[PDB]
Each structure stands twice: as C-alpha cells, then as structure tokens.
Amino acid sequence: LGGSPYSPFRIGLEGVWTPEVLKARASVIGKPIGESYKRILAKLQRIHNSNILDERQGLMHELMELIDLYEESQPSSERLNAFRELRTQLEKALYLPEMEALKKQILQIPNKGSGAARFLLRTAMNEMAGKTSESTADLIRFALQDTVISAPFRGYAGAIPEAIDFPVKYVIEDISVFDKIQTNYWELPAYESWNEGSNSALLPGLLRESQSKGMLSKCRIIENSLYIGHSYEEMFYSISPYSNQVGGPYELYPFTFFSMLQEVQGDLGFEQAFATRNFFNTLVSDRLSLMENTMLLTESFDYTPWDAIYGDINYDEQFAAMSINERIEKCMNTYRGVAFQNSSKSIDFFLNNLTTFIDNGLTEIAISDLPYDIVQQEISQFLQGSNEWKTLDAMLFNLDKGDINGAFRKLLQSAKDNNIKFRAIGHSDNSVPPFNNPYKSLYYKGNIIAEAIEKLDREGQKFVVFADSSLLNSTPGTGRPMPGLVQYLKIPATVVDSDGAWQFLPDVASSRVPIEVTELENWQVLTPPQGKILGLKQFKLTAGFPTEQSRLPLLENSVSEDLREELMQKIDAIKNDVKMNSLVCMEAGSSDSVSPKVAARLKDMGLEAGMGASITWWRREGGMEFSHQMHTTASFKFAGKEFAVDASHLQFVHDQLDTTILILPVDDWALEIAQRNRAINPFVEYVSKTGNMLALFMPPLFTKPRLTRAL
Ligand SMILES: OC[C@H]1O[C@H](O[C@H]2O[C@H](CO)[C@@H](O)[C@H](O)[C@H]2O)[C@H](O)[C@@H](O)[C@@H]1O
Ligand SMILES: OC[C@H]1O[C@H](O[C@H]2O[C@H](CO)[C@@H](O)[C@H](O)[C@H]2O)[C@H](O)[C@@H](O)[C@@H]1O
C-alpha cells in the first residue's frame, strides 16, 4: 500500500479548506484578489491536487510561510481571520496531537517553505515508523545553529535577466545600497586616478579591471542590479590582503569589491542578505541531506581495528623508535598511507624526504586546505602545465600567508615535477569561520571524510594526506564520537615537532565523545518501543494461500547450502514428532497454551530454544472500533537464526491441505500471519508471550487507525 488510509502519516486533507471555501471566507467587499492572495489560492489548489505525500506536506509548509509573510506585510488586513484559520488547519493536518514538542521545534525555524521543515517532518515520521535511525533531534540542533537555515530570509526573490550566462547565487537588487555604507572607497589612494563620486560609481570599474586579470569573472551589473556566481566561501578564501595587496599579482580591486559587499551585509548573514531564494532553498535542503549522511557515517563505527594497530599507549614510542626511513617504508608498504598535520613544518619534512616516499610507491598527495568543488579542474590545469588556474593561485597565496615560496605551493609544485597525483579533499560549503559551533564543525569535517573515503582508500594506492588536527583524529559528534580521516582510512596521524621530530599524533580520549546537549523543549522520544512495525498499511495475501511449496524457498535461502540438508532433517523431525502433533490446535487464541508446550518439547528433542516471537495488529470491529489481535510462537535456534514452530496457525485462514505445524524463519512467519489475517499496522516483538502479556499485547498506540480532523 503506497499511501494507506490506516497510516497515521497519510497527511489527509479532510480538515483543510479548498480554494473555493477560502474565497467565500476571505472575501471582502470592494477588495479584489491581490497578488499575494492569488498565489495563496494557487498553492492551496496544488496541495489538494497533490498525490505524492512528501510533496503535499512540502507544499503545505510553503503555504504556512506565505500566510506568515502576508500576516507580517498586511497586519491590519481583514482577510487575516480566514488565513489564520487555514494556517492552523495546515499545522493540525501535518502535526498529530502527540507531536506537540516536534511541531514547536520545527515551526520555530524561520522560512517554513525553505525545505527545512519538510525535511525535518519527513525524518521525524520515518523515525517514528522505525524506518530511519534516531536523528531528528540532532538535525533540529544543526538547523537551529546554522547561519543559513536559522536565518529569516532577506535576500532576492525577483527574476534573473536572460543575458547572464552563469548560474546566479547572490543578487544585490539596488546598487545604491553601496553608497549608504560608512567607508568611502572612492576616496582611497588607489582610486584617485578614477575620479569617482561614490562607491556605486567605482563598482562597474572594479569588476571590469578584475575581470581582465582573471578574477571576478562571474559578476555582472544589469540595470542597477549586481548578479554574482562566485560562492561566499570561494571569494573569502581567494580574496584577502595576502592575495590582493597594493601592486600585487591580483591588485586591490577584488578585495575592495568583497570588502564593501561585507559592509552592505551589516550584521546579517551573507546568504540571508544577498542569496537568491532559489539558491537559498537549495542550500538549506542540501546542507540537511549532507549532515544526515555524515551522522549516518558515524553510526556504529568500530574503533577496534584502528585501536588494535595505533591505539596502544606506547605506539608513539614504537613509531619514534624506528628510523625515519623505516617509518616511511612502514607507512607506504604496510599502512599504505600516512597523514600529517597541515603545518609548513610537516610539509617541509615531507618534501625533504620525498624521494624516499616515491621509491616506496607513493601515488598520491591529498590536502583538505583546498576545496575540490572549486579548484579541482584548476589543479589539473596546473599539473598539465596549462595556465587557467587563477583561483587556485590566489588560494595558495592565502594559505601561504602571501609567501612566494610557501609550503602549500611547494607541495603542489613537487607533485607536478615528480608526476605524483594531487587531490583537494576539502569542500567549500560552510567552510568560512568562526567554527564556534560543534555542528558546523561536524558538517564540514563530514564532507571532507566522505570525499576521502571515496577517493583515497583504494587497493592500488599509497597516499599522503595533509589536514587540520580537528580533521585527522576524533571530534565530538551526534550522540557518539565523530572519527577522523585517519580512523576511517586505517592510517596514523602525525606531526612534525618545532625541532624536526616526526611523531605520532594520538587520538586522545577527551575528543572521542558525543557533543554536549540539552534536551530540546519538552522533547519526546520518536523511535518505536522495541521490536518492529512491519508496515503502516493493511497486509494482504499477494499470491493466494501459502503452501509448503511456496515456503520451501524461504527455508532453503535462510541458511547456507552446506547446512541446508540438516535444517530440512530438523524440520522433518519436528513435523513427524508424535508429541508435537499432540499439541496441534486450531482454536482461536490457542497459541497461549500451545506455544510453551512446543518450547518444552523442542528442548526434549535436543534442539536449542529460541526466544520466540509475537505479532499483534489492529482489526476493524463493528461501529468504527478497532480491536487488537495477537499471536505468539515458540522457536528453535539454528545457524544463528530463529525458526518459528507454530502448532496453532490453522486457527487462521489457510490452504485446504496445509501442514498442521508451521515452520519458517521468524520474519517470514510474521509476514505470513499478518497477510493471512489481513492485519492493519502489525507489530512484532521477538519474544514469545503468555497470559496477560499476550492478552494485552498491542501495537504502538499512535498506529491505531484514527479519523482525520475535522472540520
Ligand atoms: O510567522 C509567525 C510566527 O511563526 C512561528 O510561531 C508560531 O509557531 C510556534 C510553534 O508552533 C508557536 O509557538 C507560536 O505560537 C506560533 O505563532 C515562529 O516561531 C515565529 O518566529 C513567527 O513570528
Ligand atoms: O530584503 C528585505 C526583505 O526580505 C524579505 O523579502 C524577501 O523574501 C521573500 C520570501 O522569499 C520574498 O517574498 C520577497 O519578495 C523578498 O524581497 C522579507 O520578507 C521582507 O520583510 C524584507 O523587507
């Protein structure tokens, strides 16, 4: 069932007004339908025409924002009674009564139609359904601190001129905002020969001159509006006094352009102030996608393999005891890789010993201090001897503090001359400081690790990585530690001392922790109790009654081929046991007394007892009531798997010739029982139950089918 009427998450529209009902409710005498209101009406229609439930709830969140905006811009509008009513209906259609705390957290985030609320509700519902792991609270925490997601949108929503040939990220709509800032950049010594009245008058010149030198190529002014295709982070790491001093390789013009952008920005966020809404919404939803993958990556990470090699208290001494050349040989031929802290000292040491590394099969050098999403093609240009690498070059001046030599530049140079592959593993997004928040840090680290896993641990590779200490070893994560590049790649992290000692960098215990959290306001746990919701639908027989014929593949595929014949022997033994056939019952509810007798007989036959299993579900009763129905079974253990032995299954609808004792892997047993009973929202616990504990065993209460509000 792709959208069951029995699911609590069906997002039903029964209690949400249609456009025509709204018209009559929001009609005011002498006031024709304005443009805000006509887009509110079109959004409502889309909601009612929406078949895809995820999209529907997305559109509903969008409508809530439009109503928020209308309410803010028209505080005395007489249409506000109807709109406030509609907004409440949308909240109640999306957020069930038991979701109050979730609702409060999600709807406090600004810009309800930005994609954050859509993502958070999707995640919350999957978490409650037991289809995703525990993640919602932490994603809410990430969202609340993020300078893009948690910012009320103040950017550009207008159209983009068609003459622009680059994808636009930021727009300054009215150029005259530059003339409103504190600093007179037109009065600067470097612009006396320009003789310009104001900042906005400098602007066309600043672009034109930088544009020729290679920089700022994705900036265009059309009709008093400035359009930008360079990312905030790209600009920050390629434009500074280190790369843009007076009379330098890239002059002053980019730095002045960026400096006054930041002044116009004020104490708003960059994206909050200048971003296109399209680009804003894309950023919000991609940040959340990526943080989710990062968190998933930390889940159940096993430190045992790494600690087994590098985690002994004295590994530092065993590393130090070796000669420098013995370490290089070990790192290259045994570990297949090593990582250095991103200091110039470490780079210098590496370069001083480069021949030794190459002779032992070094194939690649990787650094996190450059963003592949910006400069990877330009890096390839450098290596191919070509000249189209201006942004790369400017970023190297920044990394090298404006030095002509500089460790990072030397590193790139050696890779070219020695035919070693060079890779950037940094990602530009969310990479600009301050890193005063563990979630921003974790997000940034996670993207670098994902790239490194993808590109670096490949069987025919011997690599060296240069990265920040925070990226190399473990850091605080979401409910658990966030492991470093080095743990993920199965390598050691190293530093070079101030007096040239190449030493191991231990993963300290204080870093291998969860991020410190306060519980969110009134927060309730979302994940289901214990056991499993099979599905939020009505289960049905797909292909008629099950038979021993149909069950055979389920039994044979449950175990390896060399164990197949022993399982069948055990199943034959059970089905042809005299005391087992005595226990057979087709009375309604008989599993209560039968199941324990089965467990006792299995024991006496010399089989290993399993935990058993129980299934419970809702059943439509007379007069719109739903009762709970349940069934339990004993099991045996074989090859680390549990097999139901169900001698009371014939109380349920069955094939005419069917066996009296049902034997299937527990998961196949549950499905069969659910389908034969046409079970609504069935729930399995992997224990057999008896007496009161069977008689009142029911699914999670939020799954009991209910009517939608109302109106
Ligand atoms: O745009 C209006 C306001 O919307 C949000 O506040 C609403 O939603 C909260 C959570 O459900 C409620 O606590 C609150 O009573 C509602 O008004 C948002 O949190 C505010 O910042 C907006 O001003
Ligand atoms: O630039 C200041 C204004 O920012 C917001 O308005 C922008 O964002 C809205 C939602 O995307 C658009 O509808 C609107 O056209 C944009 O200008 C904010 O809503 C306003 O209060 C500010 O004046």
CSV table of C-alpha atoms in Angstrom, one decimal, residues 228-443:
chain,number,residue,atom,x,y,z
A,228,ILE,CA,27.1,37.0,-8.6
A,229,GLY,CA,28.1,33.4,-9.4
A,230,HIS,CA,31.1,33.1,-7.0
A,231,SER,CA,30.2,31.4,-3.7
A,232,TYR,CA,30.7,33.3,-0.5
A,233,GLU,CA,33.4,30.8,0.6
A,234,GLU,CA,35.1,30.8,-2.8
A,235,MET,CA,35.5,34.6,-2.5
A,236,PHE,CA,36.6,34.5,1.2
A,237,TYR,CA,39.5,32.1,0.5
A,238,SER,CA,40.7,33.7,-2.7
A,239,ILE,CA,40.3,37.4,-1.8
A,240,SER,CA,42.3,38.9,1.1
A,241,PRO,CA,45.3,41.2,1.6
A,242,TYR,CA,47.6,38.2,1.2
A,243,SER,CA,46.4,37.8,-2.4
A,244,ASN,CA,45.1,41.3,-3.0
A,245,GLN,CA,47.7,43.8,-1.7
A,246,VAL,CA,48.5,47.1,-3.5
A,247,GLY,CA,50.6,46.4,-6.6
A,248,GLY,CA,50.4,42.6,-6.2
A,249,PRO,CA,49.6,39.8,-8.6
A,250,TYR,CA,45.8,40.4,-8.4
A,251,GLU,CA,45.8,44.1,-7.3
A,252,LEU,CA,43.3,45.6,-4.9
A,253,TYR,CA,40.1,45.6,-6.9
A,254,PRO,CA,38.7,42.2,-5.9
A,255,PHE,CA,39.4,42.9,-2.2
A,256,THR,CA,37.6,46.3,-2.4
A,257,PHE,CA,34.6,44.6,-4.2
A,258,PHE,CA,34.4,41.9,-1.4
A,259,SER,CA,35.1,44.4,1.4
A,260,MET,CA,32.1,46.6,0.6
A,261,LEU,CA,29.9,43.6,0.0
A,262,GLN,CA,30.6,42.7,3.6
A,263,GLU,CA,29.8,46.2,4.7
A,264,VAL,CA,26.4,46.3,2.9
A,265,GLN,CA,25.9,42.9,4.6
A,266,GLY,CA,25.9,44.5,8.0
A,267,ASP,CA,25.3,42.1,10.9
A,268,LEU,CA,23.0,39.9,8.7
A,269,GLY,CA,24.3,36.6,7.4
A,270,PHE,CA,25.8,36.7,3.9
A,271,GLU,CA,23.2,34.3,2.4
A,272,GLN,CA,20.4,35.9,4.5
A,273,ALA,CA,21.3,39.3,2.9
A,274,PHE,CA,22.2,38.5,-0.7
A,275,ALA,CA,21.2,35.0,-1.8
A,276,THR,CA,18.6,34.2,-4.4
A,277,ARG,CA,15.7,32.4,-2.8
A,278,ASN,CA,16.1,29.5,-5.3
A,279,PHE,CA,19.8,29.2,-4.2
A,280,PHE,CA,18.8,29.7,-0.5
A,281,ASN,CA,16.3,26.9,-0.7
A,282,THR,CA,18.8,24.6,-2.4
A,283,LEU,CA,21.5,25.3,0.2
A,284,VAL,CA,19.1,24.6,3.1
A,285,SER,CA,18.0,21.2,1.7
A,286,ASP,CA,21.5,20.1,0.6
A,287,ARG,CA,23.0,21.0,4.0
A,288,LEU,CA,20.4,18.8,5.7
A,289,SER,CA,20.9,15.9,3.2
A,290,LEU,CA,24.7,16.1,3.8
A,291,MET,CA,24.5,16.4,7.6
A,292,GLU,CA,22.3,13.3,7.6
A,293,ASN,CA,24.9,11.3,5.6
A,294,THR,CA,27.6,12.5,8.0
A,295,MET,CA,25.6,11.4,11.0
A,296,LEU,CA,24.9,8.1,9.4
A,297,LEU,CA,28.6,7.7,8.7
A,298,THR,CA,29.4,8.0,12.4
A,299,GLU,CA,26.8,5.4,13.4
A,300,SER,CA,28.2,2.1,14.8
A,301,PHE,CA,31.7,3.0,13.7
A,302,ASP,CA,34.0,0.3,15.1
A,303,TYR,CA,37.3,1.7,16.6
A,304,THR,CA,38.6,-1.8,17.4
A,305,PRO,CA,40.6,-2.3,14.1
A,306,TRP,CA,42.3,1.1,14.4
A,307,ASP,CA,43.0,0.9,18.1
A,308,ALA,CA,44.4,-2.6,17.6
A,309,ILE,CA,47.1,-1.1,15.4
A,310,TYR,CA,47.7,2.5,16.5
A,311,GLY,CA,45.8,2.7,19.8
A,312,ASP,CA,48.2,1.2,22.3
A,313,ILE,CA,49.6,3.5,25.0
A,314,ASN,CA,53.1,3.1,23.6
A,315,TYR,CA,52.5,3.3,19.8
A,316,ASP,CA,54.1,6.8,19.9
A,317,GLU,CA,57.3,5.2,21.3
A,318,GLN,CA,57.2,2.3,18.7
A,319,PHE,CA,56.8,4.9,16.0
A,320,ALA,CA,59.6,7.0,17.4
A,321,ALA,CA,61.9,4.0,18.0
A,322,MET,CA,62.0,3.3,14.2
A,323,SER,CA,64.4,5.2,11.9
A,324,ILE,CA,62.9,7.9,9.7
A,325,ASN,CA,63.4,5.7,6.6
A,326,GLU,CA,61.9,2.7,8.5
A,327,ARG,CA,58.8,4.8,9.2
A,328,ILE,CA,58.4,5.9,5.6
A,329,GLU,CA,58.7,2.2,4.5
A,330,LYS,CA,56.2,1.1,7.1
A,331,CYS,CA,53.7,3.9,6.2
A,332,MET,CA,54.0,3.2,2.5
A,333,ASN,CA,54.2,-0.6,2.3
A,334,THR,CA,52.3,-1.7,5.4
A,335,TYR,CA,49.8,1.1,6.2
A,336,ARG,CA,49.5,2.2,2.6
A,337,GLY,CA,49.2,5.8,3.8
A,338,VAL,CA,50.1,8.4,6.4
A,339,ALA,CA,48.6,11.8,7.3
A,340,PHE,CA,50.4,15.0,8.5
A,341,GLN,CA,49.1,18.0,10.4
A,342,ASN,CA,48.7,20.8,7.8
A,343,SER,CA,51.7,22.9,9.2
A,344,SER,CA,54.5,24.1,7.0
A,345,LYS,CA,57.0,22.2,9.2
A,346,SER,CA,55.2,18.9,8.3
A,347,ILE,CA,55.1,19.8,4.6
A,348,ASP,CA,58.9,20.7,4.6
A,349,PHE,CA,59.8,17.4,6.3
A,350,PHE,CA,57.7,15.5,3.7
A,351,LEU,CA,59.4,17.4,0.9
A,352,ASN,CA,62.9,16.8,2.4
A,353,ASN,CA,62.2,13.0,2.3
A,354,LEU,CA,60.1,13.0,-0.9
A,355,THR,CA,62.5,10.7,-2.8
A,356,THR,CA,62.1,8.0,-0.1
A,357,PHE,CA,58.3,8.2,-0.3
A,358,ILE,CA,58.3,7.9,-4.1
A,359,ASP,CA,60.7,5.0,-4.1
A,360,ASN,CA,58.3,3.1,-1.8
A,361,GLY,CA,55.4,3.6,-4.3
A,362,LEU,CA,53.8,6.9,-3.3
A,363,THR,CA,51.0,7.5,-5.9
A,364,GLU,CA,49.0,10.4,-4.4
A,365,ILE,CA,49.1,13.6,-2.3
A,366,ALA,CA,45.9,14.9,-0.8
A,367,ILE,CA,45.1,18.1,1.1
A,368,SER,CA,42.0,19.4,2.9
A,369,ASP,CA,43.1,23.0,2.7
A,370,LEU,CA,41.8,23.3,-0.9
A,371,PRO,CA,38.2,22.8,-2.0
A,372,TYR,CA,37.8,20.3,-4.8
A,373,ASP,CA,34.4,21.7,-5.7
A,374,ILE,CA,36.1,25.0,-6.7
A,375,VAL,CA,39.7,24.2,-7.8
A,376,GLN,CA,39.9,20.6,-8.9
A,377,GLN,CA,39.9,21.4,-12.6
A,378,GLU,CA,42.3,24.2,-12.0
A,379,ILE,CA,44.6,21.8,-10.1
A,380,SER,CA,44.5,19.6,-13.1
A,381,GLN,CA,45.4,22.6,-15.3
A,382,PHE,CA,48.4,23.3,-13.1
A,383,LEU,CA,49.6,19.7,-13.4
A,384,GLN,CA,49.1,19.7,-17.2
A,385,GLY,CA,51.3,22.8,-17.4
A,386,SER,CA,48.3,25.0,-18.6
A,387,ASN,CA,47.7,28.5,-17.2
A,388,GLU,CA,44.0,28.6,-16.3
A,389,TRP,CA,44.4,28.3,-12.5
A,390,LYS,CA,44.0,31.9,-11.2
A,391,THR,CA,41.6,31.0,-8.3
A,392,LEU,CA,43.9,28.1,-7.3
A,393,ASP,CA,46.9,30.5,-7.4
A,394,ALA,CA,45.1,33.1,-5.2
A,395,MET,CA,44.0,30.5,-2.7
A,396,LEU,CA,47.7,29.4,-2.4
A,397,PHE,CA,48.7,32.9,-1.5
A,398,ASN,CA,46.1,32.9,1.2
A,399,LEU,CA,47.3,29.5,2.6
A,400,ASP,CA,50.9,30.6,2.4
A,401,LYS,CA,50.2,33.9,4.1
A,402,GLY,CA,51.3,35.8,1.0
A,403,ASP,CA,54.7,34.0,0.7
A,404,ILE,CA,56.1,33.4,-2.8
A,405,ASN,CA,57.7,30.1,-1.7
A,406,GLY,CA,55.2,28.8,0.8
A,407,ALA,CA,54.8,25.2,1.9
A,408,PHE,CA,51.4,24.6,0.1
A,409,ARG,CA,52.7,26.0,-3.2
A,410,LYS,CA,55.9,24.0,-2.9
A,411,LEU,CA,53.8,20.9,-2.3
A,412,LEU,CA,51.8,21.4,-5.4
A,413,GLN,CA,55.0,22.1,-7.4
A,414,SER,CA,56.7,18.8,-6.3
A,415,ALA,CA,53.6,16.8,-7.3
A,416,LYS,CA,53.9,18.3,-10.8
A,417,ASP,CA,57.6,17.8,-11.2
A,418,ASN,CA,57.6,14.3,-9.7
A,419,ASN,CA,54.4,13.1,-11.5
A,420,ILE,CA,52.5,12.4,-8.3
A,421,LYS,CA,48.7,12.8,-8.3
A,422,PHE,CA,47.4,15.8,-6.3
A,423,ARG,CA,44.0,15.9,-4.8
A,424,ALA,CA,41.9,18.5,-2.9
A,425,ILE,CA,39.6,16.9,-0.4
A,426,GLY,CA,38.1,20.0,1.2
A,427,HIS,CA,34.6,21.1,0.4
A,428,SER,CA,33.9,24.8,0.1
A,429,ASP,CA,30.4,24.9,1.6
A,430,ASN,CA,30.1,26.1,5.3
A,431,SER,CA,34.0,26.3,5.4
A,432,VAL,CA,34.3,30.0,6.5
A,433,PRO,CA,34.9,30.7,10.2
A,434,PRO,CA,34.1,31.1,13.0
A,435,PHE,CA,33.9,27.4,13.9
A,436,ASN,CA,32.3,28.3,17.2
A,437,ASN,CA,29.7,25.5,16.9
A,438,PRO,CA,30.3,21.7,17.0
A,439,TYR,CA,27.5,21.0,14.4
A,440,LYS,CA,29.1,23.4,11.8
A,441,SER,CA,32.5,21.7,12.6
A,442,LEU,CA,31.0,18.2,12.2
A,443,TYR,CA,29.2,19.2,9.0
